[PDB]
A paper describes a structure:
Three capsid types have been recognized from the nuclei of herpesvirus-infected cells: empty A-capsids, scaffolding-containing B-capsids, and DNA-filled C-capsids. Here, portal proteins assemble into a dodecameric basket-like structure that is thought to seed the assembly of scaffolding proteins, in turn driving the formation of spherical procapsids composed of MCP, SCP, and triplexes.
To improve the resolution of the portal baskets, we carried out separate sub-particle reconstructions and refined them while imposing C12 symmetry, leading to portal basket structures at resolutions of 3.6, 3.5, and 3.7 Å for the A-, B-, and C-capsids, respectively. The C12 reconstruction of both A- and B-capsid portal baskets revealed a small hook-like density with large aromatic side chains and sharp turns wedged into a hydrophobic pocket between the crown domains of each portal monomer. Indeed, we found the scaffolding protein residues 449–455 (PYYPGEA, numbered relative to pUL26) to be a good fit for the small density. Based on our model, P452 interacts with the essential residues W127 and L131 (both adjacent to W90) from the first portal monomer, whereas Y451 forms a hydrophobic interface with Y83 and Y608 from the second portal monomer. Our A-capsid portal reconstructions still contain scaffolding hook densities, although with weaker density than in B-capsids, suggesting low occupancy, but even residual presence of the scaffolding protein suggests that these capsids were likely never fully packaged with genome, as full genome content in the capsid lumen should displace the portal-bound scaffold. A- and B-capsids varied in portal height by ~2 and ~1 nm, respectively, could rotate up to 13 degrees relative to the capsid shell, and exhibited up to 1 nm of portal basket “sway,” due to flexibility between the clip and nearby wing and stem domains. Our analyses of portal basket variability revealed that non-mature A- and B-capsid portals permit more rotational flexibility than mature-state C-capsid portals, which may be important for the dynamic process of genome packaging, during which torque is applied to the genome substrate.
Author numbering:
A (entry chain d), B (entry chain e): 24 to 27, 29 to 310, 494 to 623
Write the structure that this text describes.
Amino acid sequence: DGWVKVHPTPGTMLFREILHGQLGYTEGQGVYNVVRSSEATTRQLQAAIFHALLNATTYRDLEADWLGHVAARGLQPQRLVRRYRNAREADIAGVAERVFDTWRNTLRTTLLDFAHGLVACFAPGGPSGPSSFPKYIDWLTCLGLVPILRKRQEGGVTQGLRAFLKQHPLTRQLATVAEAAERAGPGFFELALAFDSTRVADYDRVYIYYNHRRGDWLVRDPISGQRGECLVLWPPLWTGDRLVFDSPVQRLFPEIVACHSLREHAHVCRLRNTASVKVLLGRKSDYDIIDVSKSMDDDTYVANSFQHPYIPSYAQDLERLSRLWEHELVRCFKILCHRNNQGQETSISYSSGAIAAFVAPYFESVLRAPRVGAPITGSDVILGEEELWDAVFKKTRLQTYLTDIAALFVADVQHA
Amino acid sequence: DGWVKVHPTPGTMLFREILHGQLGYTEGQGVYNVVRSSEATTRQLQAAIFHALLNATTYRDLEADWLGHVAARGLQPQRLVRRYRNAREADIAGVAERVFDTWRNTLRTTLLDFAHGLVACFAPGGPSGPSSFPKYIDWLTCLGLVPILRKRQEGGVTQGLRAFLKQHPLTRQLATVAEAAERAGPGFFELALAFDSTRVADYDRVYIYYNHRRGDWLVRDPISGQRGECLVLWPPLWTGDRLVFDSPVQRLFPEIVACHSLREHAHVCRLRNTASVKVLLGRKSDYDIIDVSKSMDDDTYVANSFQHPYIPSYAQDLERLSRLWEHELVRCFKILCHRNNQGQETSISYSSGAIAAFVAPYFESVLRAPRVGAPITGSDVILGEEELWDAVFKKTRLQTYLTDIAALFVADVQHA
């Protein structure tokens, strides 16, 4: 009843195998390896965790803990000035600044350690297991669909968070960490459940049906019998007894098949020339390969014979196809390449537009994540994780409180 | 009865299948992938939302909030000067300046967070669902027409806006944000209704009819029976025996068809040369392939034979066609190319004229949106969301109010 089977057809499997280089290979197709890297999602996740944790802190606990530290040292400004008993303002100011700098540095190191402790829990899930990003990207590169299956249940990531959080000494040792972690905990649990709940269907098991009249998508898991929820990023076109997707492989397909056929023909012609001497026979009127044409002669005579050992040339086509693959992928997925003065490709990375267009829908639709704050810029992908923590620390809330309390402490030290 | 059937004709479908590389592909055609992108539209939406939110604020509530912050700290000028009891006006001025700087930075980050909160509601609707932008662009690239369908109803975007606004706490926390959100809300709801109401018809379901004498357009949805409206951007020409559009595919159409025919002929000629030795027979006067001319000789003799194994070459034509595609699209859609010292195509973007010519009609005619403020320039498309927010933030009302308040506060502190 107007239903069509879309995915399990042989053409789709041929697309997928074309991606594995089952008919030819090129230098251009090698760029794809970077398009599947999971680095950007992990960087975004690190940025999200850092933003969530640092945003929780507040001025009250920071001031309370600084006061507790100065009381523990017994280094209150009154006592310090009473000990020194001289009015050299520069020396006392420098001493106070260095004390506060020591405390500040140690606090930043502790916070960084805890933050890295948090991230390590989520990282393995992104590339592998439920919600694997490379599978998503190659799903898009093949069809533009992304059949997704969902169930709600606690699993690995939630258990990891539960084990990591509920015993960490750092929360007990500092009020800042205690309040920040207790406030940020619920969101992390929501995100962990989001990571655990959703899995992307496997390319060799799922079934997809499409119906033109309603434009309805039915997706089916044949093993468990579980119905899924289809997603379409680049809508296809229906043209009768057909269905034409707009994925890159479909656009490139009519070209690579012709190139492959040319290569097969050139292979066939080469074997023909292996024998270097040929003989032609006929009927009288009345290494080495010989052509017995006697069987057709009757009241006929041989008029002429010709030789032309043709061998098709195909290197030009391979160069053209390599450049075509490279340009197609680079322009389609918004890849950005850095270059030397004349040398090419020092590194390859997602552009800002690339992360915005591809990573964002992953988190929002595929994962159904709570929130990720402002997205990271393309330049922050190249940064290391430590540098990412540093950079997010520079602009975010905590540094303002630190500078304010430091300046006030120095002023009160001098004026006390 | 004097009407013409336009769209579902075979040539119209052949145009779109050409767009999917159903006859050849090239490096030039790959540039089209950047034309479809929805980046500029989302940048425009972000700019519009940021303009709307900041403009709503007012000075009196901001001054009241600053005074409330100072009172909560208890750090009023009189108390502070009485506390320090020295005439070093520069030091106290710096202390006050740093206090205000802390408050200003906190306000900046808070408003940025809320603004990003608002934007997320609209963004997903642009690229997919009703009023999808790439569908509009490919409609234009194929014909220059854009059939539209309309119903007034409240859908996903309005529900998201309703849920987000009534729950948000910043309205309670800050009076300025409360008033700004209350003022900007109605415009957001009208814009959300604009997003939800309109729909761009699918290229494989809609019918289009044209009447030369009257000069009016009829667009029909056959499955629903609904009647739509047609937007004609580059009007066609009725030459009596046809209807000729002026879309880029129409202009490039003869060239690509000629090149495809040349490639097919060159393919056919190649298979003809696979056999290297040929034999030609004749009739008595009373790997290998045999040409039997027995049955056609009588009262005749053979006089001469010629061999010339021609093989057309087509690489030059493919190069010409790639360059033609690239230049045509670049000049038609006002795309802008960035380049290294000598290297080409570091990135591709939309020129200011491109957004003015294409994005503006989308919003105003296709979407019937209320207002978008002044348009962004082509440079701001490259910038990230943070940078765009900063750029709009710097040059608007809030900064004048903040700097006035800071100047007055510091001056009064030091004069007291």
